[PDB]
Amino acid sequence: KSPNVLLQNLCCRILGRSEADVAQQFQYAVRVIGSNFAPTVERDEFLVAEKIKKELIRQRREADAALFSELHRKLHSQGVLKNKWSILYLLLSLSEDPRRQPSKVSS
Amino acid sequence: LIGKSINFLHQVCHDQTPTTKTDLENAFQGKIDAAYFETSKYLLDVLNKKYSLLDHMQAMRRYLLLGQGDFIRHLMDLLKPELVRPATTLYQHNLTGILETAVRATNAQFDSPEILRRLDVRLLEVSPGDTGWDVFSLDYHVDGPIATVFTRECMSHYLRVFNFLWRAKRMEYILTDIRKGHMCNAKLLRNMPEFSGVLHQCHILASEMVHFIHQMQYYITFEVLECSWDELWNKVQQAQDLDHIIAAHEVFLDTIISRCLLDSDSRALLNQLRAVFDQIIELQNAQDAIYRAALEELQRRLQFEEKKKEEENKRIGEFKESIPKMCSQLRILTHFYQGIVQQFLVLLTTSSDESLRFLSFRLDFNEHYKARE
Amino acid sequence: AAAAAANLNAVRETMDVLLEISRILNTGLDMETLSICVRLCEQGINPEALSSVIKELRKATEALK
C-alpha cells in the first residue's frame, strides 16, 4: 500500500466514520505525516527497554517486570522487523495509568 | 577477614596504620584472635566516629522509614498542590529548592549537616497518567566507605516501604481533611436542623474510617517501627566485626518488609487496602458536594429576604428531592465499605499470621466485627 | 514450502507478544488498530508523528461524536 491512503484506512478503524463522510481528519493526518514523510528520528531502544523495566517495578509487581524482559528478548530473537523501537515508542507514549494493574493474564 | 580488613582500612578509608603484628603447638590461634579483635574494632571506631555511621543509621529511620513526623507533615502541607497535579508539569529542581527553606522554617534545621546534604528529591520517571504523588521518593544517597555498609539494594527495598507508608500518611491527612470539613463546617451549619440526619450519615463513615486508620498508625508505630529498631540497636551494640553490622541490618530490613504488606502472599491484602485508600478520597468528593450545594441556597435566601426589606419555596422543592438521592448515594457507599472491611477481616486465615493477628487484635475491639455489627 | 510458512509464523508470533505489550502499557489501541500501526512501522515512520495523530483522533470521537 501507499502510505497516504493507509492514513485514511487508519481513520476509519479508529473512528466509526467513513472515508467519504469526513475529509478533515484525513487532512490532519496528511498535515502531520507530510513534511515528515521520510524517517529522520533516531532510535535508542536500549534506554527505552530500561525505562519499561523501571515502570514495571513501579507497579510493585516484580515478577512481571522480568517476564516482560524475556518477552522483550523474543522480538530480537525473531528479528523479521524493521525497528523494534518504533511500535514500542508508540505504545509507551499513549500510556494511561492502570493505577497498579489489578490483573494480568500473562498469556 | 584480617587481611581484607587492613586493606580496606588503607585503601578506601584512607587511614594508614599498622596496629597489628594440637595444630602447630596451637600457634595460630592466639595471634589470630588478638588480630581479629584489634583490627576489626579499630575499623569500626573510625567508621562510627569520623564518617558518623551512628547518626546516619539514626536518620535512615527518620527519613526513609518516615520516623520524624514533623518533616513529613510540613512537607505534605506545603507540597499538596504541586504533587496532586500530574508529573508532566512537575520538575524536580523546584521541589529540591523549596525543601531547604522549608526545613529552615520548621524544626529540622538543628540537625547535623551530614544528613542535610544526603537528602534530595528523587524522581522515578515521567510517564503520562501518573500523579506526582506516585513519582516522589526522597533519594537519601550515601557515599564514602559507609556505602559498602548501606547498599543501593538496601535503598531499593526502602523505597518500596516508603511508597506504602507515604500513601498511609497522605491518606491519613486526607482523613484529617475530612474531619476538618466536618468540624469547621458544622459550626456554621447551626442555622437549619434539616441537615442533622444526613450530617450524621457523613459523621459515622468518618468515624468508622478513623477507628481503622488511627489504630493502624499505632500498629506501625509500636510493632513495626519500634521492635525492629530495638533489635537493631542491640545488634549494633553487640557488634565486633563489620559482618555483624551488615548481616544484622539486612534482617532489620527483611523484617520491616514482611511486617508491611509487600510480600508475595500479602499482595491480596494490600489490594484490598487499596480499596480503603480509594474510598477515603471518594468520601472527600462526597462531602464537598453536599456543602457546596447546601450553602448556596441559604445565601441567596438571605439576599431574597433583603429584597423584600414564594420564589424560595421552589428551592425547597429541589432540596426535598435532592436529600434522598444524596442520602442513598452515601448509603450504598457505606454498604460497599462495610462489605469490604468485613471481607478484609474474614480473609485473614492461618498460613503464618505472625503480624496480621496482631493488627486485627487492635482493629477489632468492642467485638463489633464478626458479631455482624 | 516450510520457510515461507515459518516467515508467516514469525509475524504472527510477534503480533501476539505485542498484544501483551499493548495491554500492560494500557493503550486504547486494540489488535485491529495495532495491525495498521505495525505495518506503518514496518515501512519505517516517525512514532512521534503517529502518537500525536492518535492522541487527536481518539480525541476526535469522545468530544466530537
Side-chain angles (χ1 to χ4, degrees), chain A residues 1-99 102, chain B, chain C:
Chain A
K1 205 80 149 181
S2 159
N4 56 6
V5 62
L6 266 189
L7 312 184
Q8 208 170 216
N9 301 7
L10 186 59
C11 304
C12 82
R13 300 308 284 186
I14 294 143
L15 298 96
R17 189 159 194 168
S18 90
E19 71 185 65
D21 203 332
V22 84
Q24 176 61 261
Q25 282 79 305
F26 183 45
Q27 194 166 264
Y28 175 63
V30 177
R31 179 187 312 181
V32 43
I33 297 302
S35 72
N36 288 114
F37 205 73
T40 43
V41 299
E42 185 265 1
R43 52 177 169 155
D44 47 338
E45 43 180 60
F46 188 72
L47 177 71
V48 316
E50 184 263 299
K51 287 169 69 170
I52 304 289
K53 298 193 197 69
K54 200 194 297 299
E55 277 150 342
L56 291 176
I57 300 292
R58 184 167 47 75
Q59 309 276 268
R60 280 79 188 84
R61 317 172 302 158
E62 275 57 53
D64 306 339
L67 172 56
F68 162 72
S69 317
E70 298 183 23
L71 293 173
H72 174 256
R73 197 258 321 152
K74 290 201 182 183
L75 265 71
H76 317 89
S77 317
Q78 295 177 81
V80 302
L81 298 96
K82 179 74 163 175
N83 293 344
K84 190 208 57 62
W85 179 74
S86 48
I87 53 184
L88 293 190
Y89 203 76
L90 185 45
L91 210 61
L92 72 83
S93 44
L94 303 196
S95 41
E96 282 86 38
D97 202 3
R99 316 326 310 187
Chain B
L1 183 55
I2 298 318
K4 178 171 60 172
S5 51
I6 192 63
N7 289 351
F8 176 65
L9 183 62
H10 293 346
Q11 294 155 11
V12 189
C13 320
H14 307 130
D15 305 73
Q16 283 72 241
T17 321
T19 83
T20 200
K21 306 168 64 165
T22 181
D23 291 332
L24 210 49
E25 290 90 10
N26 293 110
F28 308 116
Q29 285 276 3
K31 52 167 180 58
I32 286 172
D33 295 8
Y36 181 33
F37 292 139
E38 55 204 76
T39 69
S40 43
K41 288 301 282 203
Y42 197 71
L43 176 75
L44 295 186
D45 293 355
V46 311
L47 210 55
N48 186 44
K49 299 169 169 69
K50 276 75 163 181
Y51 305 104
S52 171
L53 171 73
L54 174 74
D55 294 343
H56 293 355
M57 53 81 83
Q58 162 72 17
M60 190 94 59
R61 173 192 71 81
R62 284 179 52 166
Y63 291 133
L64 258 173
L65 293 85
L66 296 94
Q68 175 56 40
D70 208 15
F71 173 67
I72 302 134
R73 192 265 302 159
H74 194 55
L75 166 74
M76 282 190 177
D77 182 50
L78 300 179
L79 183 46
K80 170 66 163 56
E82 288 76 54
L83 280 184
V84 65
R85 303 179 301 186
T88 45
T89 176
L90 302 202
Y91 294 117
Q92 186 187 299
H93 40 77
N94 303 109
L95 306 181
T96 303
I98 297 303
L99 193 148
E100 303 288 303
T101 77
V103 172
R104 298 314 186 278
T106 193
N107 312 67
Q109 72 171 335
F110 323 111
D111 299 2
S112 87
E114 293 77 70
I115 66 172
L116 302 160
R117 71 175 50 101
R118 320 275 79 183
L119 180 155
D120 36 356
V121 172
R122 213 182 196 243
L123 188 50
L124 273 68
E125 64 188 282
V126 54
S127 309
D130 293 326
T131 181
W133 294 96
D134 293 4
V135 285
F136 191 94
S137 82
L138 285 185
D139 189 13
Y140 194 9
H141 67 263
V142 76
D143 301 331
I146 56 195
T148 65
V149 177
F150 305 145
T151 64
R152 50 93 181 170
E153 322 186 280
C154 201
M155 321 313 193
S156 56
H157 305 100
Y158 277 143
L159 296 202
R160 285 174 61 86
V161 186
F162 184 93
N163 188 230
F164 195 11
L165 205 153
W166 171 259
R167 292 180 306 200
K169 271 205 163 174
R170 174 187 181 190
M171 295 295 141
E172 191 272 332
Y173 281 121
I174 298 309
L175 173 143
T176 310
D177 200 9
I178 299 297
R179 187 57 67 167
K180 179 69 154 73
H182 279 182
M183 60 204 302
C184 86
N185 297 332
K187 57 192 282 311
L188 272 303
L189 287 210
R190 303 290 303 268
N191 305 117
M192 301 294 305
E194 65 182 1
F195 295 112
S196 43
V198 300
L199 177 79
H200 184 73
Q201 294 177 357
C202 312
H203 287 182
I204 296 303
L205 188 48
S207 319
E208 281 170 13
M209 287 179 179
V210 171
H211 179 84
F212 194 97
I213 298 296
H214 186 50
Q215 184 278 294
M216 157 194 183
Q217 185 275 325
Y218 283 144
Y219 161 79
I220 299 298
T221 306
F222 300 112
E223 309 94 44
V224 185
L225 190 55
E226 270 297 275
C227 165
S228 62
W229 160 248
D230 192 13
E231 287 216 59
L232 177 65
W233 185 247
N234 305 334
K235 292 176 302 181
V236 176
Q237 312 304 284
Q238 206 43 59
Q240 75 298 329
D241 62 333
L242 202 149
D243 295 7
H244 205 259
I245 297 288
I246 298 186
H249 203 187
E250 74 188 66
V251 189
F252 174 78
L253 171 145
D254 210 355
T255 191
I256 300 308
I257 66 183
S258 45
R259 290 162 199 203
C260 310
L261 276 54
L262 285 84
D263 290 344
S264 77
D265 293 330
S266 52
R267 50 90 200 161
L269 270 302
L270 181 59
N271 286 170
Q272 194 180 194
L273 191 55
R274 305 314 314 281
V276 196
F277 291 166
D278 188 14
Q279 294 301 274
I280 179 161
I281 194 65
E282 157 61 32
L283 263 295
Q284 184 65 66
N285 291 318
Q287 165 195 89
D288 53 16
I290 308 293
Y291 282 116
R292 200 161 30 204
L295 168 66
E296 166 185 352
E297 185 276 343
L298 276 300
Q299 311 173 99
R300 60 183 60 241
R301 189 207 294 210
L302 288 182
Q303 306 317 305
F304 181 81
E305 182 65 28
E306 290 175 65
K307 184 259 303 187
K308 294 291 294 174
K309 281 192 172 61
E310 57 277 0
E311 178 183 287
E312 295 282 329
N313 283 22
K314 317 288 193 296
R315 305 277 308 202
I316 302 299
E318 186 175 0
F319 262 67
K320 92 178 182 291
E321 62 89 19
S322 57
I323 54 162
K325 283 197 177 181
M326 298 183 314
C327 177
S328 88
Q329 177 85 98
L330 317 174
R331 281 316 305 179
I332 194 60
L333 296 202
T334 54
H335 292 322
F336 188 87
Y337 170 70
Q338 283 300 109
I340 296 308
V341 61
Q342 77 177 126
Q343 197 44 58
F344 193 97
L345 58 96
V346 81
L347 273 156
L348 317 180
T349 63
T350 179
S351 48
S352 317
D353 288 342
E354 305 178 336
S355 44
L356 312 98
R357 195 193 302 173
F358 299 173
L359 184 42
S360 66
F361 276 0
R362 301 314 95 209
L363 168 58
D364 195 5
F365 188 83
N366 184 71
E367 300 328 285
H368 200 93
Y369 299 142
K370 194 27 205 167
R372 311 310 182 195
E373 292 83 63
Chain C
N7 278 21
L8 197 75
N9 188 29
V11 178
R12 179 59 158 82
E13 298 163 63
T14 303
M15 295 329 105
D16 220 347
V17 172
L18 265 301
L19 194 49
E20 186 77 275
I21 303 172
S22 55
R23 61 175 302 267
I24 58 120
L25 309 173
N26 196 13
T27 58
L29 166 133
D30 69 331
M31 154 74 176
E32 273 61 50
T33 39
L34 175 144
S35 315
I36 302 184
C37 307
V38 78
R39 287 274 168 82
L40 306 162
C41 312
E42 274 317 304
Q43 307 314 122
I45 192 169
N46 298 12
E48 312 188 307
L50 291 197
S51 308
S52 44
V53 326
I54 185 60
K55 286 164 211 152
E56 190 41 59
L57 315 174
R58 292 188 301 174
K59 206 152 62 171
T61 175
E62 48 201 348
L64 314 185
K65 183 180 293 196

PDB file of all heavy atoms in Angstrom, chain B residues 2-20 39 42-43 46 51 145:
ATOM      1  N   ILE B   2      41.022 -10.720  58.162  1.00  0.00           N
ATOM      2  CA  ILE B   2      42.073  -9.870  58.721  1.00  0.00           C
ATOM      3  C   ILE B   2      42.782  -9.095  57.622  1.00  0.00           C
ATOM      4  O   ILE B   2      42.889  -7.856  57.679  1.00  0.00           O
ATOM      5  CB  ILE B   2      43.078 -10.700  59.536  1.00  0.00           C
ATOM      6  CG1 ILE B   2      42.401 -11.383  60.720  1.00  0.00           C
ATOM      7  CG2 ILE B   2      44.222  -9.823  60.029  1.00  0.00           C
ATOM      8  CD1 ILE B   2      41.439 -10.523  61.441  1.00  0.00           C
ATOM      9  N   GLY B   3      43.289  -9.822  56.620  1.00  0.00           N
ATOM     10  CA  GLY B   3      43.971  -9.163  55.515  1.00  0.00           C
ATOM     11  C   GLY B   3      43.051  -8.232  54.749  1.00  0.00           C
ATOM     12  O   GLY B   3      43.433  -7.108  54.389  1.00  0.00           O
ATOM     13  N   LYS B   4      41.798  -8.664  54.557  1.00  0.00           N
ATOM     14  CA  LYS B   4      40.798  -7.847  53.884  1.00  0.00           C
ATOM     15  C   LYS B   4      40.492  -6.573  54.661  1.00  0.00           C
ATOM     16  O   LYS B   4      40.359  -5.495  54.069  1.00  0.00           O
ATOM     17  CB  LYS B   4      39.530  -8.675  53.691  1.00  0.00           C
ATOM     18  CG  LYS B   4      38.384  -7.933  53.046  1.00  0.00           C
ATOM     19  CD  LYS B   4      37.252  -8.873  52.684  1.00  0.00           C
ATOM     20  CE  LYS B   4      36.714  -9.581  53.914  1.00  0.00           C
ATOM     21  NZ  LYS B   4      35.491 -10.362  53.595  1.00  0.00           N
ATOM     22  N   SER B   5      40.421  -6.670  55.990  1.00  0.00           N
ATOM     23  CA  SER B   5      40.073  -5.519  56.811  1.00  0.00           C
ATOM     24  C   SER B   5      41.184  -4.481  56.808  1.00  0.00           C
ATOM     25  O   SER B   5      40.916  -3.277  56.725  1.00  0.00           O
ATOM     26  CB  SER B   5      39.766  -5.976  58.236  1.00  0.00           C
ATOM     27  OG  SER B   5      40.811  -6.789  58.738  1.00  0.00           O
ATOM     28  N   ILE B   6      42.445  -4.926  56.879  1.00  0.00           N
ATOM     29  CA  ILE B   6      43.530  -3.943  56.906  1.00  0.00           C
ATOM     30  C   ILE B   6      43.706  -3.294  55.530  1.00  0.00           C
ATOM     31  O   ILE B   6      43.962  -2.078  55.427  1.00  0.00           O
ATOM     32  CB  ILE B   6      44.833  -4.568  57.457  1.00  0.00           C
ATOM     33  CG1 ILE B   6      45.862  -3.477  57.764  1.00  0.00           C
ATOM     34  CG2 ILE B   6      45.419  -5.654  56.555  1.00  0.00           C
ATOM     35  CD1 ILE B   6      45.418  -2.518  58.848  1.00  0.00           C
ATOM     36  N   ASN B   7      43.468  -4.065  54.456  1.00  0.00           N
ATOM     37  CA  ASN B   7      43.473  -3.492  53.113  1.00  0.00           C
ATOM     38  C   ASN B   7      42.362  -2.468  52.946  1.00  0.00           C
ATOM     39  O   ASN B   7      42.579  -1.394  52.373  1.00  0.00           O
ATOM     40  CB  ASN B   7      43.313  -4.599  52.077  1.00  0.00           C
ATOM     41  CG  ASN B   7      44.538  -5.462  51.961  1.00  0.00           C
ATOM     42  OD1 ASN B   7      45.584  -5.148  52.523  1.00  0.00           O
ATOM     43  ND2 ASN B   7      44.417  -6.566  51.235  1.00  0.00           N
ATOM     44  N   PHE B   8      41.174  -2.786  53.460  1.00  0.00           N
ATOM     45  CA  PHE B   8      40.024  -1.898  53.344  1.00  0.00           C
ATOM     46  C   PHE B   8      40.228  -0.620  54.140  1.00  0.00           C
ATOM     47  O   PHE B   8      39.805   0.463  53.718  1.00  0.00           O
ATOM     48  CB  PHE B   8      38.773  -2.624  53.825  1.00  0.00           C
ATOM     49  CG  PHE B   8      37.550  -1.766  53.839  1.00  0.00           C
ATOM     50  CD1 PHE B   8      37.026  -1.273  52.655  1.00  0.00           C
ATOM     51  CD2 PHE B   8      36.928  -1.443  55.031  1.00  0.00           C
ATOM     52  CE1 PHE B   8      35.895  -0.477  52.657  1.00  0.00           C
ATOM     53  CE2 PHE B   8      35.795  -0.646  55.044  1.00  0.00           C
ATOM     54  CZ  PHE B   8      35.279  -0.163  53.853  1.00  0.00           C
ATOM     55  N   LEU B   9      40.854  -0.742  55.312  1.00  0.00           N
ATOM     56  CA  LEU B   9      41.156   0.427  56.125  1.00  0.00           C
ATOM     57  C   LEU B   9      42.126   1.353  55.411  1.00  0.00           C
ATOM     58  O   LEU B   9      41.999   2.581  55.492  1.00  0.00           O
ATOM     59  CB  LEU B   9      41.727  -0.015  57.469  1.00  0.00           C
ATOM     60  CG  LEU B   9      42.042   1.097  58.469  1.00  0.00           C
ATOM     61  CD1 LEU B   9      40.774   1.842  58.844  1.00  0.00           C
ATOM     62  CD2 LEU B   9      42.718   0.527  59.703  1.00  0.00           C
ATOM     63  N   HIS B  10      43.081   0.785  54.679  1.00  0.00           N
ATOM     64  CA  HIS B  10      44.014   1.654  53.970  1.00  0.00           C
ATOM     65  C   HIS B  10      43.392   2.278  52.727  1.00  0.00           C
ATOM     66  O   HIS B  10      43.476   3.493  52.521  1.00  0.00           O
ATOM     67  CB  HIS B  10      45.272   0.877  53.609  1.00  0.00           C
ATOM     68  CG  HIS B  10      46.069   0.472  54.802  1.00  0.00           C
ATOM     69  ND1 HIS B  10      45.854   1.018  56.049  1.00  0.00           N
ATOM     70  CD2 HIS B  10      47.081  -0.414  54.946  1.00  0.00           C
ATOM     71  CE1 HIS B  10      46.697   0.481  56.911  1.00  0.00           C
ATOM     72  NE2 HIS B  10      47.453  -0.390  56.267  1.00  0.00           N
ATOM     73  N   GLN B  11      42.751   1.464  51.892  1.00  0.00           N
ATOM     74  CA  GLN B  11      42.519   1.879  50.514  1.00  0.00           C
ATOM     75  C   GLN B  11      41.313   2.799  50.378  1.00  0.00           C
ATOM     76  O   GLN B  11      41.346   3.756  49.598  1.00  0.00           O
ATOM     77  CB  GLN B  11      42.372   0.648  49.631  1.00  0.00           C
ATOM     78  CG  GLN B  11      43.655  -0.149  49.545  1.00  0.00           C
ATOM     79  CD  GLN B  11      43.412  -1.598  49.213  1.00  0.00           C
ATOM     80  OE1 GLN B  11      42.304  -1.984  48.848  1.00  0.00           O
ATOM     81  NE2 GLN B  11      44.448  -2.415  49.344  1.00  0.00           N
ATOM     82  N   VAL B  12      40.238   2.527  51.105  1.00  0.00           N
ATOM     83  CA  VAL B  12      39.013   3.310  50.986  1.00  0.00           C
ATOM     84  C   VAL B  12      38.900   4.335  52.097  1.00  0.00           C
ATOM     85  O   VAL B  12      38.601   5.502  51.846  1.00  0.00           O
ATOM     86  CB  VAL B  12      37.777   2.386  50.964  1.00  0.00           C
ATOM     87  CG1 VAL B  12      36.524   3.185  50.628  1.00  0.00           C
ATOM     88  CG2 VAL B  12      37.983   1.267  49.972  1.00  0.00           C
ATOM     89  N   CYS B  13      39.134   3.911  53.334  1.00  0.00           N
ATOM     90  CA  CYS B  13      39.010   4.814  54.465  1.00  0.00           C
ATOM     91  C   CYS B  13      40.152   5.814  54.534  1.00  0.00           C
ATOM     92  O   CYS B  13      39.988   6.864  55.167  1.00  0.00           O
ATOM     93  CB  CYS B  13      38.932   4.005  55.758  1.00  0.00           C
ATOM     94  SG  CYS B  13      37.912   2.522  55.594  1.00  0.00           S
ATOM     95  N   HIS B  14      41.276   5.509  53.872  1.00  0.00           N
ATOM     96  CA  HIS B  14      42.454   6.371  53.747  1.00  0.00           C
ATOM     97  C   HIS B  14      43.098   6.667  55.095  1.00  0.00           C
ATOM     98  O   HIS B  14      43.560   7.784  55.344  1.00  0.00           O
ATOM     99  CB  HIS B  14      42.130   7.665  52.996  1.00  0.00           C
ATOM    100  CG  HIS B  14      41.471   7.431  51.676  1.00  0.00           C
ATOM    101  ND1 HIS B  14      40.321   8.082  51.290  1.00  0.00           N
ATOM    102  CD2 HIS B  14      41.800   6.609  50.652  1.00  0.00           C
ATOM    103  CE1 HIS B  14      39.969   7.673  50.084  1.00  0.00           C
ATOM    104  NE2 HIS B  14      40.849   6.777  49.676  1.00  0.00           N
ATOM    105  N   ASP B  15      43.133   5.663  55.967  1.00  0.00           N
ATOM    106  CA  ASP B  15      43.895   5.711  57.209  1.00  0.00           C
ATOM    107  C   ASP B  15      45.035   4.713  57.105  1.00  0.00           C
ATOM    108  O   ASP B  15      44.797   3.516  56.913  1.00  0.00           O
ATOM    109  CB  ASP B  15      43.024   5.386  58.426  1.00  0.00           C
ATOM    110  CG  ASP B  15      41.804   6.273  58.531  1.00  0.00           C
ATOM    111  OD1 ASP B  15      40.872   6.084  57.724  1.00  0.00           O
ATOM    112  OD2 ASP B  15      41.772   7.141  59.436  1.00  0.00           O
ATOM    113  N   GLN B  16      46.266   5.198  57.233  1.00  0.00           N
ATOM    114  CA  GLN B  16      47.438   4.330  57.249  1.00  0.00           C
ATOM    115  C   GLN B  16      47.833   4.067  58.693  1.00  0.00           C
ATOM    116  O   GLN B  16      48.309   4.975  59.386  1.00  0.00           O
ATOM    117  CB  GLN B  16      48.612   4.946  56.490  1.00  0.00           C
ATOM    118  CG  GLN B  16      48.517   4.866  54.978  1.00  0.00           C
ATOM    119  CD  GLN B  16      47.482   5.806  54.415  1.00  0.00           C
ATOM    120  OE1 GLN B  16      46.517   5.379  53.781  1.00  0.00           O
ATOM    121  NE2 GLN B  16      47.664   7.099  54.659  1.00  0.00           N
ATOM    122  N   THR B  17      47.619   2.840  59.156  1.00  0.00           N
ATOM    123  CA  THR B  17      48.073   2.472  60.489  1.00  0.00           C
ATOM    124  C   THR B  17      48.392   0.986  60.543  1.00  0.00           C
ATOM    125  O   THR B  17      47.478   0.156  60.471  1.00  0.00           O
ATOM    126  CB  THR B  17      47.036   2.772  61.580  1.00  0.00           C
ATOM    127  OG1 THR B  17      46.367   4.014  61.337  1.00  0.00           O
ATOM    128  CG2 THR B  17      47.732   2.882  62.917  1.00  0.00           C
ATOM    129  N   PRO B  18      49.659   0.604  60.643  1.00  0.00           N
ATOM    130  CA  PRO B  18      49.966  -0.684  61.263  1.00  0.00           C
ATOM    131  C   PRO B  18      49.648  -0.611  62.747  1.00  0.00           C
ATOM    132  O   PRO B  18      50.235   0.177  63.490  1.00  0.00           O
ATOM    133  CB  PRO B  18      51.464  -0.865  60.998  1.00  0.00           C
ATOM    134  CG  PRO B  18      51.975   0.483  60.693  1.00  0.00           C
ATOM    135  CD  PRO B  18      50.849   1.224  60.043  1.00  0.00           C
ATOM    136  N   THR B  19      48.675  -1.407  63.173  1.00  0.00           N
ATOM    137  CA  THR B  19      48.420  -1.596  64.594  1.00  0.00           C
ATOM    138  C   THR B  19      48.862  -3.007  64.933  1.00  0.00           C
ATOM    139  O   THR B  19      49.588  -3.245  65.905  1.00  0.00           O
ATOM    140  CB  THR B  19      46.936  -1.432  64.949  1.00  0.00           C
ATOM    141  OG1 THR B  19      46.254  -2.664  64.692  1.00  0.00           O
ATOM    142  CG2 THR B  19      46.293  -0.372  64.114  1.00  0.00           C
ATOM    143  N   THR B  20      48.420  -3.944  64.107  1.00  0.00           N
ATOM    144  CA  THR B  20      48.581  -5.349  64.411  1.00  0.00           C
ATOM    145  C   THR B  20      50.006  -5.804  64.116  1.00  0.00           C
ATOM    146  O   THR B  20      50.803  -5.105  63.486  1.00  0.00           O
ATOM    147  CB  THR B  20      47.565  -6.176  63.622  1.00  0.00           C
ATOM    148  OG1 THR B  20      47.406  -7.458  64.242  1.00  0.00           O
ATOM    149  CG2 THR B  20      48.010  -6.343  62.180  1.00  0.00           C
ATOM    150  N   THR B  39      41.971  -5.246  64.818  1.00  0.00           N
ATOM    151  CA  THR B  39      41.769  -4.616  63.517  1.00  0.00           C
ATOM    152  C   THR B  39      40.302  -4.303  63.268  1.00  0.00           C
ATOM    153  O   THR B  39      39.967  -3.191  62.822  1.00  0.00           O
ATOM    154  CB  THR B  39      42.323  -5.495  62.397  1.00  0.00           C
ATOM    155  OG1 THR B  39      41.525  -6.681  62.265  1.00  0.00           O
ATOM    156  CG2 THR B  39      43.797  -5.829  62.625  1.00  0.00           C
ATOM    157  N   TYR B  42      39.113  -1.385  65.530  1.00  0.00           N
ATOM    158  CA  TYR B  42      39.670  -0.100  65.112  1.00  0.00           C
ATOM    159  C   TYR B  42      38.978   0.435  63.865  1.00  0.00           C
ATOM    160  O   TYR B  42      38.699   1.641  63.762  1.00  0.00           O
ATOM    161  CB  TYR B  42      41.162  -0.262  64.862  1.00  0.00           C
ATOM    162  CG  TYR B  42      41.930   1.029  64.830  1.00  0.00           C
ATOM    163  CD1 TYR B  42      42.149   1.756  65.993  1.00  0.00           C
ATOM    164  CD2 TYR B  42      42.459   1.514  63.641  1.00  0.00           C
ATOM    165  CE1 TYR B  42      42.867   2.938  65.971  1.00  0.00           C
ATOM    166  CE2 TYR B  42      43.179   2.693  63.609  1.00  0.00           C
ATOM    167  CZ  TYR B  42      43.378   3.401  64.776  1.00  0.00           C
ATOM    168  OH  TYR B  42      44.094   4.577  64.747  1.00  0.00           O
ATOM    169  N   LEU B  43      38.682  -0.459  62.916  1.00  0.00           N
ATOM    170  CA  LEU B  43      37.928  -0.079  61.727  1.00  0.00           C
ATOM    171  C   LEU B  43      36.533   0.424  62.081  1.00  0.00           C
ATOM    172  O   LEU B  43      36.064   1.436  61.536  1.00  0.00           O
ATOM    173  CB  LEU B  43      37.854  -1.282  60.794  1.00  0.00           C
ATOM    174  CG  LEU B  43      37.058  -1.229  59.500  1.00  0.00           C
ATOM    175  CD1 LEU B  43      37.789  -0.422  58.452  1.00  0.00           C
ATOM    176  CD2 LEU B  43      36.865  -2.652  59.030  1.00  0.00           C
ATOM    177  N   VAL B  46      36.796   3.972  63.541  1.00  0.00           N
ATOM    178  CA  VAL B  46      36.939   5.068  62.585  1.00  0.00           C
ATOM    179  C   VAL B  46      35.699   5.236  61.719  1.00  0.00           C
ATOM    180  O   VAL B  46      35.476   6.331  61.180  1.00  0.00           O
ATOM    181  CB  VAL B  46      38.199   4.921  61.704  1.00  0.00           C
ATOM    182  CG1 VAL B  46      39.419   4.623  62.564  1.00  0.00           C
ATOM    183  CG2 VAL B  46      38.023   3.869  60.624  1.00  0.00           C
ATOM    184  N   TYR B  51      33.283   9.119  60.065  1.00  0.00           N
ATOM    185  CA  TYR B  51      32.312   9.159  58.989  1.00  0.00           C
ATOM    186  C   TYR B  51      30.881   9.060  59.496  1.00  0.00           C
ATOM    187  O   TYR B  51      29.956   9.024  58.676  1.00  0.00           O
ATOM    188  CB  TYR B  51      32.626   8.046  57.991  1.00  0.00           C
ATOM    189  CG  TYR B  51      34.056   8.141  57.505  1.00  0.00           C
ATOM    190  CD1 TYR B  51      35.036   7.272  57.977  1.00  0.00           C
ATOM    191  CD2 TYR B  51      34.437   9.138  56.613  1.00  0.00           C
ATOM    192  CE1 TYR B  51      36.342   7.374  57.561  1.00  0.00           C
ATOM    193  CE2 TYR B  51      35.752   9.244  56.176  1.00  0.00           C
ATOM    194  CZ  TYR B  51      36.697   8.356  56.659  1.00  0.00           C
ATOM    195  OH  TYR B  51      38.006   8.437  56.247  1.00  0.00           O
ATOM    196  N   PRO B 145      33.173   5.179  52.625  1.00  0.00           N
ATOM    197  CA  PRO B 145      33.330   3.756  52.951  1.00  0.00           C
ATOM    198  C   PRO B 145      32.088   3.162  53.585  1.00  0.00           C
ATOM    199  O   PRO B 145      31.893   1.945  53.501  1.00  0.00           O
ATOM    200  CB  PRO B 145      34.528   3.741  53.907  1.00  0.00           C
ATOM    201  CG  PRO B 145      34.513   5.094  54.537  1.00  0.00           C
ATOM    202  CD  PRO B 145      34.005   6.042  53.483  1.00  0.00           C
TER     203      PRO B 145
END
